[PDB]
RNA sequence: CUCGAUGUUGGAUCAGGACAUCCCGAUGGUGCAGCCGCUAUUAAAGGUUCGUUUGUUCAACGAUUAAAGUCCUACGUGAUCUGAGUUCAGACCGGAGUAAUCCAGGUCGGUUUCUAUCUACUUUCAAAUUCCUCCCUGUACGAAAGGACAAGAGAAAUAAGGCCUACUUCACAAAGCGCCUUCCCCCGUAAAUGAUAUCAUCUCAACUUAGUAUUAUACCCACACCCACCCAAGAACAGGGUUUGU
RNA sequence: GCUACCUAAGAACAGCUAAAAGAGCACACCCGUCUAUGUAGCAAAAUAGUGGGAAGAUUUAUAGGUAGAGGCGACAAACCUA
């Protein structure tokens, strides 16, 4: 769904993600051997001239049945350890992400709405 | 008589026995889960078991924008805007994880497909998740909502103005100029509607299906 | 010297009569074989490690989804056994191979369209001709008397099978569709070179190696899908629900056999041996056999509690 | 690959195909028997059969009238369809036309066929007739039939 | 790509006289019982078909004279009546196309 | 050798081969505790990334990877493609020359034909590789820090072969972006018993064990109804069906 | 009788903007940017689309003039009957 050069939308409230910039956030690497990122995959972003890792929490490409499809490509900025940069995610995120609480426990804690 | 669209098989060389045995499974599932009558444009609330949700149950309310598939695999797509984020879920009618399908508002729209709502203003895709079901009177004609939506500026996901789509529920006069509408007419195929050999008559197929449905209800 | 066909010289009155006559004989011949165990059956030996039993010939009806109790979706292929009978038995000595063989045929066809040699073979067998005949390697203890009918309940849910059939024929195809070649760019000056093979060899050898990938006929050859799980058996219609997809088009004839994969070796201890005899069966099997993990159509909705 | 493609590719494209077929169908309604290349007659035969069904709906059915208006380029034939052809087949549910192969066309050796609406007033085509019931083979089978019927009643 | 060498008549004869290139004998030719001329089993007799077409053309020319113009198709059925015949009870209300010749034997009145 | 012509860089396409092995396998040594390394023996089945600038091969850099191997094949491959460069005719700059013109320099522009006669080839039908997660385990190891192997479980990517239930492009069907299946080994050494040489010694001593496949099995297999029609079979031919020949 | 330049006397240039125009948009008309096709071709230089100009140093019909040690040239060593 989300590959290199794909422009993404940061759905968290981090300052890095919401500050105005002349270039939109863009994917420059997907941490998957096939280079195609789906919900739950980490990607590298070129955002405000910096390199920051992000977690995909939604995309427009149809997925398996019974899974939500969003009108935008949504990502959440995280650190290398997996900690979220922001403190609140207002945009709804799929419940399927809760299968990955082992590694994404803190990111889920800041998610207000699930779909 | 409403025959759910998944019961009418698509034209092809499939052996009729395959459709007969598939209908036995659809009817056996229909007596465990009540699948109500609904159309594209109706507001539904679907409850499904989810292993990772809170309470192991999930509820989603949205407008039905597409009905597709045949047999056990038939599906429908619900659309809604939650916190400004448009979301769609393609539900499987006969998937055993579905607990309930509730028709919040039963109605039809000017089009058999509302995929163009993705390119309309968000207001036309926004429905309160806690809206109360509106009662449907007995033996009344299904209400046809003649709402024509206003579209966002081009480009759109698809060329909704092209004749092949045959969309009647869009305010084209507001969003498109006269020259743009004339260009779209270059793709018109006036001979298509009169091509008799393309007509697919399901009258006899539907009549036989109704007999199989009635037999199951007796046993 | 001019060619002839069955109803060339028949009058308006005789064409309906002949059709009805031959049709009834076919039905009578098939009904006479429904009691194999009462017609001097061969010895029924017990299953032993290393034993190989016969397979089936089935028609591919189509595909259908089913869900497991864990919520996962599995698509399956419906295979209907249509008039499957054992035709010939060849002993290990006469086979010219390491094992004995048992010939099986499936699906009745018109006698007016078969060669004379084939018709006299079926005349002696007392069965109408079959569309497809396949040869199954078996052990001596698995031999079955020619003329014995075979049913879908020959297999049981939980078993793994191999399905062999002719793939869909796509005719003469280029390298891109046939072999997955990348082709050449759409623009930037390509001159009449977009879907072509490119270089086919090096200049040194001054030839093309045998087996080089080139344009040619695609599909319409025998392929085998291994390790397909049997999810469900419908004994009334004699249909096998097999996991995934099988080669060939819908309504084609497929060869069904026990899976030969090493992981599934010696799993026939609980399977019917040498085959399933519904007449012999003491208790009639239910209309549907289900694997333990399959959600039956009438079961309550899944709940994760 | 053309699996399951039921329509032929003729004329200058999809539209021209319909117009080519429409001209053949219009000529058939007027003359009730025409000859044309075998493939084109075979393709048009399907439309010629369905046209009668629309004619049976009646001239008061607006959908039937629109269909007839399109497929009949000569408007004097629309009354004929509804008042002559459709009543003639009132007691039939199909098989309104018969198509037979005729000798190849002289100029280009094209395979040719003649198609006509059954029940026309024109001289009858030399239809292929089955062998008489009095032939040697048919008499041997008649005896076999007689015998079987006698054995069943007993 | 041009021929590197001339092809011999020996090679050319093998290509030209190959059984694939030869004309195949037809085994579906039979005599027409009505006229005696030859016909193919699956094709109508050429001689008989031409005879039917000649009569069909004559009748059609008569229909034209009665119609007397374009876009004048009748709304009633038609019956061809030859010399020495009159309309039957079933021929009432049908346009009568009169042919100035004796009814052909193969053409049966109905 | 070839100037009565063997078309000249890099790239695209498709790759055949070598092993002097980049990764994966198996071993000896270590200044090898462990985790990582270094070096050597054996191994060519399988694999060996995507981008910014540059015509570039290279190189630098960004982000990755189990790894981003070295070579040969007319510096593989233009009767398959590309023409940015180089290398005609126009032009400008610097320099040389009295000038015409010139420059291992730079710069902008600049026509890439071929209908295949022969050789070869056009289903080597079917055994698959790798990473990661969990677990083992915070165990072996170690002062601590740090931190495995084997076994087992799951989940993926790629490759090969198929398929259309749903999704998607679509709509009697063909497709992927979707789904399904995928099964053996490989030899370097490590060890016993035991002579020549009455100890010892794994032995181009007789011999024993790790240690091996007659690669297993699978697939295919009956064929003067056949004029004609239909087809999921197909360029033609062939093949399947017609008990569907008004 | 092509083409370069010239001489005599002719012809053509919609619509819109500006209203002043070797001005802009844009037909006819003239030219030939880029790509594909074509390459014994429809064509010994073309076709399709895309383009420059289109009241001017414009385009164009007719007749005449300049001739090879030459002509003519808004110099490309252009053009002077493929
Ligand atoms: K040379
Ligand atoms: K040669
Ligand atoms: K020694
Ligand atoms: K031309
Ligand atoms: Mg910067
Ligand atoms: Mg789109
Ligand atoms: Mg095919
Ligand atoms: Mg491509
Ligand atoms: Mg070219
Ligand atoms: Mg091209
Ligand atoms: Mg044509
Ligand atoms: Mg030479
Ligand atoms: Mg290679
Ligand atoms: Mg080596
Ligand atoms: Mg390799
Ligand atoms: Mg080279
Ligand atoms: Mg070329
Ligand atoms: Mg070459
Ligand atoms: Mg160049
Ligand atoms: Mg200078
Ligand atoms: Mg240059
Ligand atoms: Mg240029
Ligand atoms: Mg060629
Ligand atoms: Mg481990
Ligand atoms: Mg010792
Ligand atoms: Mg000793
Ligand atoms: Mg003047
Ligand atoms: Mg003007
Ligand atoms: Mg101007
Ligand atoms: Mg201008
Ligand atoms: Mg001189
Ligand atoms: Mg100059
Ligand atoms: Mg010069
Ligand atoms: Zn005749």
UniProtKB/Swiss-Prot annotation, chain A:
Alphabetized UniProt keyword annotations: Mitochondrion, Ribonucleoprotein, Ribosomal protein, Transit peptide
The keyword Protein biosynthesis belongs to this UniProt entry's keyword annotation: no
GO MF, one annotated term: structural constituent of ribosome
Keyword Membrane: no
Location relative to the cell: Mitochondrion
GO cellular component terms listed in the entry, alphabetical order: mitochondrial inner membrane; mitochondrial large ribosomal subunit; mitochondrion
Signal peptide feature range: none
Gene Ontology annotations of biological process type: mitochondrial translation
Top-level taxon of the source organism: Eukaryota
Similarity section: Belongs to the universal ribosomal protein uL14 family.
Protein task: Forms part of 2 intersubunit bridges in the assembled ribosome. Upon binding to MALSU1 intersubunit bridge formation is blocked, preventing ribosome formation and repressing translation.
Quaternary structure and interacting proteins, as annotated: Component of the mitochondrial large ribosomal subunit (mt-LSU). Mature mammalian 55S mitochondrial ribosomes consist of a small (28S) and a large (39S) subunit. The 28S small subunit contains a 12S ribosomal RNA (12S mt-rRNA) and 30 different proteins. The 39S large subunit contains a 16S rRNA (16S mt-rRNA), a copy of mitochondrial valine transfer RNA (mt-tRNA(Val)), which plays an integral structural role, and 52 different proteins. Interacts with MALSU1.
Protein's UniProt name: Large ribosomal subunit protein uL14m
Organism: Homo sapiens (Human)
Curated annotation (Swiss-Prot), chain B:
Keywords carried by this UniProt record: Mitochondrion, Phosphoprotein, Ribonucleoprotein, Ribosomal protein, Transit peptide
A molecular function GO annotation: structural constituent of ribosome
GO cellular component, one term: mitochondrial large ribosomal subunit
Localization per record: Mitochondrion
Phosphoserine modification, residue list: 4
Keyword 4Fe-4S: no
GO term, biological process aspect, one: mitochondrial translation
Major localization listed first in the record, in broad terms: mitochondrion
Subunit and interaction comment: Component of the mitochondrial large ribosomal subunit (mt-LSU). Mature mammalian 55S mitochondrial ribosomes consist of a small (28S) and a large (39S) subunit. The 28S small subunit contains a 12S ribosomal RNA (12S mt-rRNA) and 30 different proteins. The 39S large subunit contains a 16S rRNA (16S mt-rRNA), a copy of mitochondrial valine transfer RNA (mt-tRNA(Val)), which plays an integral structural role, and 52 different proteins.
Family to which this protein belongs: Belongs to the bacterial ribosomal protein bL19 family.
Name of the featured protein: Large ribosomal subunit protein bL19m
Source organism per UniProt: Homo sapiens
Portion of the full sequence shown: 74 to 292 of 292
Swiss-Prot record, chain D:
GO molecular function: protein domain specific binding; structural constituent of ribosome
Keyword flag Manganese: no
Pfam annotation, one family: Ribosomal_L17
GO cellular component: mitochondrial inner membrane; mitochondrial large ribosomal subunit; mitochondrion
Tissues in which the UniProt entry reports expression: Detected in adrenal gland, mammary gland and adipose tissue.
InterPro entries: Ribosomal_bL17, Ribosomal_bL17_sf
Keywords: Mitochondrion, Ribonucleoprotein, Ribosomal protein, Transit peptide
NCBIfam families attached to this UniProt entry: L17 (TIGR00059)
Recorded family membership: Belongs to the bacterial ribosomal protein bL17 family.
Quaternary context: Component of the mitochondrial large ribosomal subunit (mt-LSU). Mature mammalian 55S mitochondrial ribosomes consist of a small (28S) and a large (39S) subunit. The 28S small subunit contains a 12S ribosomal RNA (12S mt-rRNA) and 30 different proteins. The 39S large subunit contains a 16S rRNA (16S mt-rRNA), a copy of mitochondrial valine transfer RNA (mt-tRNA(Val)), which plays an integral structural role, and 52 different proteins.
Name this polypeptide is given: Large ribosomal subunit protein bL17m
From Swiss-Prot, chain E:
Record's comment on post-translational modification: MRPL32 precursor is processed by the m-AAA protease (composed of AFG3L2 and SPG7), which cleaves the N-terminal transit peptide. Cleavage by the m-AAA protease takes place prior to assembly into the large subunit, an essential step for mitochondrial ribosome (mitoribosome) assembly. Proper processing by the m-AAA protease is dependent on the zinc-binding region within the tightly folded C-terminal domain of MRPL32: zinc-dependent folding halts degradation initiated from the N-terminus and triggers the release of mature MRPL32.
Superkingdom field: Eukaryota
GO biological process: mitochondrial translation; translation
Disulfide bridge map: none
Skewed-composition ranges (Basic and acidic residues): 91-103
GO cellular component: mitochondrial inner membrane; mitochondrial large ribosomal subunit; mitochondrial matrix; mitochondrial ribosome; mitochondrion
Entry's localization field: Mitochondrion
Location of the region described as Disordered in the Swiss-Prot/TrEMBL record: 86-110
GO molecular function: RNA binding; structural constituent of ribosome
Residues given in the record as Zn(2+) binding sites: 32, 35, 45, 48
Keyword hit for Nucleotide-binding: no
Keywords: Mitochondrion, Ribonucleoprotein, Ribosomal protein, Transit peptide
Function: Component of the mitochondrial large ribosomal subunit (mt-LSU). The mitochondrial ribosome (mitoribosome) is a large ribonucleoprotein complex responsible for the synthesis of proteins inside mitochondria.
Family to which the UniProt record says this protein belongs: Belongs to the bacterial ribosomal protein bL32 family.
Name the record gives this protein: Large ribosomal subunit protein bL32m
Origin species: Homo sapiens
Gene: MRPL32
Shown part of the complete sequence: 79 to 188 of 188
């Amino acid at each position: 769904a989300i590959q290199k050069m794909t422009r993404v939308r940061v759905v968290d409230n981090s300052a890095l993600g919401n500050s105005p910039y002349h270039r939109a956030p863009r994917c420059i690497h997907v941490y998957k051997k096939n280079g195609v990122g789906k919900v739950g995959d980490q990607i590298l972003l070129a955002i405000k001239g910096q390199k920051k890792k992000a977690l995909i929490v939604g995309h427009c490409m149809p997925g398996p049945r019974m899974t939500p499809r969003f009108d935008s490509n949504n990502v959440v900025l995280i650190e290398d350890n997996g900690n979220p940069v922001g403190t609140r995610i207002k945009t709804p995120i799929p419940t399927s992400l809760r299968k990955r609480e082992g590694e994404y426990s803190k990111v889920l804690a800041i998610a207000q709405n699930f779909v | 008589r409403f025959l759910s669209p998944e019961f009418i098989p698509r034209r092809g060389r499939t052996d009729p026995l395959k459709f007969q045995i598939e209908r036995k499974d659809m009817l056996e599932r229909r007596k465990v889960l009540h699948i109500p009558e609904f159309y594209v444009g109706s507001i539904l609330r679907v409850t499904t078991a989810d292993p990772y949700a809170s309470g192991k149950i999930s509820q989603f309310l949205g407008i039905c924008i597409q009905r597709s598939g045949r047999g056990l695999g038939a599906t429908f797509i619900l659309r809604n805007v939650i916190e400004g984020q448009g979301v769609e879920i393609c539900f499987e009618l006969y998937n055993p994880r579905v607990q309930e399908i509730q028709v919040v508002k039963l109605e039809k729209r000017l089009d058999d497909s509302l995929l163009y709502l993705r390119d309309a203003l968000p207001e036309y895709s926004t429905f309160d998740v806690n809206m109360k079901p509106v009662v449907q009177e007995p033996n009344q004609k299904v209400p046809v909502n003649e709402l024509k939506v206003k579209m966002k500026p081009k480009p759109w996901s698809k060329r909704w103005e092209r004749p092949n789509f045959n969309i009647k529920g869009i305010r084209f006069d507001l969003c498109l100029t006269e020259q743009q509408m004339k260009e779209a007419q270059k793709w018109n195929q006036p001979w298509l509607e009169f091509d008799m050999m393309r007509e697919y008559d399901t009258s006899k197929i539907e009549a036989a299906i109704w007999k199989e449905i009635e037999a199951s209800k007796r046993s | 010297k001019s060619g002839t066909w069955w109803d060339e010289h028949l009058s308006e009155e005789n064409v309906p009569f002949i059709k009805q006559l031959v049709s009834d004989e076919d039905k009578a011949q098939l009904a006479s074989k429904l009691c194999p165990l009462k017609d001097e059956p061969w010895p029924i030996h017990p299953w032993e490690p290393g034993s190989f039993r016969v397979g089936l010939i089935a028609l591919k009806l189509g595909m259908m989804p089913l869900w497991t109790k864990d919520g996962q979706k599995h698509v399956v292929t419906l295979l209907q056994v249509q008039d499957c009978h054992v035709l010939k038995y060849t002993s290990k000595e006469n086979c010219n191979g390491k094992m004995a063989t048992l010939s099986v045929g499936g699906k009745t066809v018109s006698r007016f369209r078969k060669a004379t040699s084939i018709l006299e073979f079926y005349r002696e067998l007392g069965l109408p001709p079959k569309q497809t005949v396949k040869i199954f390697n078996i052990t001596d203890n698995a031999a079955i008397k020619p003329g014995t009918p075979l049913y879908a309940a020959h297999f049981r849910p939980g078993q793994y099978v191999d399905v062999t059939a002719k793939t869909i024929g796509k005719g003469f195809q280029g390298v891109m569709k046939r072999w997955g070649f990348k082709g050449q760019p759409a623009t930037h000056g390509q001159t009449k070179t977009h879907r072509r093979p490119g270089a086919v060899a090096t200049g040194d050898i001054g030839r093309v190696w045998p087996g080089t990938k080139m344009p040619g006929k695609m599909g319409n050859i025998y392929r085998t899908e291994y390790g397909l799980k049997v999810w469900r058996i419908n004994t009334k219609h004699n249909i096998i629900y097999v996991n995934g997809s099988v080669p060939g088009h819908k309504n084609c004839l497929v060869k069904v056999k026990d899976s030969k994969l090493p992981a599934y070796k010696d799993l026939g201890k609980n399977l019917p041996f040498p085959t399933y005899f519904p007449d012999g069966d003491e208790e009639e099997l239910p209309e549907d056999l289900y694997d333990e993990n399959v959600c039956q159509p009438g079961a309550p909705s899944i709940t994760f509690a | 690959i053309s699996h399951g493609r039921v329509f032929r590719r003729m004329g200058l494209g999809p539209e021209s195909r319909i117009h080519l077929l429409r001209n053949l169908l219009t000529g058939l309604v007027r003359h009730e028997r025409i000859e044309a290349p075998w493939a084109r007659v075979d393709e048009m035969r399907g439309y010629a059969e369905k046209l009668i069904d629309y004619g049976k709906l009646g001239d008061t059915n607006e959908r039937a009238m629109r269909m007839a208006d399109f497929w009949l380029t000569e408007k004097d034939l629309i009354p004929k369809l509804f008042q002559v052809l459709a009543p003639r087949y009132k007691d039939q549910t199909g098989g309104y036309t018969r198509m037979l192969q005729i000798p190849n066309r002289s100029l280009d050796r094209a395979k040719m066929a003649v198609i006509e609406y059954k029940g026309n007033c024109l001289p009858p085509l030399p239809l292929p007739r089955r062998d008489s019931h009095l032939t040697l083979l048919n008499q041997l089978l008649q005896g076999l039939r007689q015998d079987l019927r006698q054995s069943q009643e007993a | 790509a041009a021929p590197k060498n001339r092809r011999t008549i020996e090679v050319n004869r093998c290509r030209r006289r190959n059984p694939q290139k030869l004309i195949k004998v037809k085994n579906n030719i039979d005599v027409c019982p009505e006229c005696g001329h030859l016909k193919q089993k699956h094709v109508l007799c050429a001689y008989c078909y031409e005879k039917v077409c000649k009569e069909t053309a004559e009748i059609r020319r008569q229909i034209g004279k009665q119609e007397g113009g374009p876009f004048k198709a009748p709304t009633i059925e038609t019956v061809v009546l030859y010399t020495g015949e009159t309309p039957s009870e079933q021929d009432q209300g049908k346009r009568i196309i009169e042919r100035d010749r004796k009814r052909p034997s193969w053409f049966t009145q109905n």
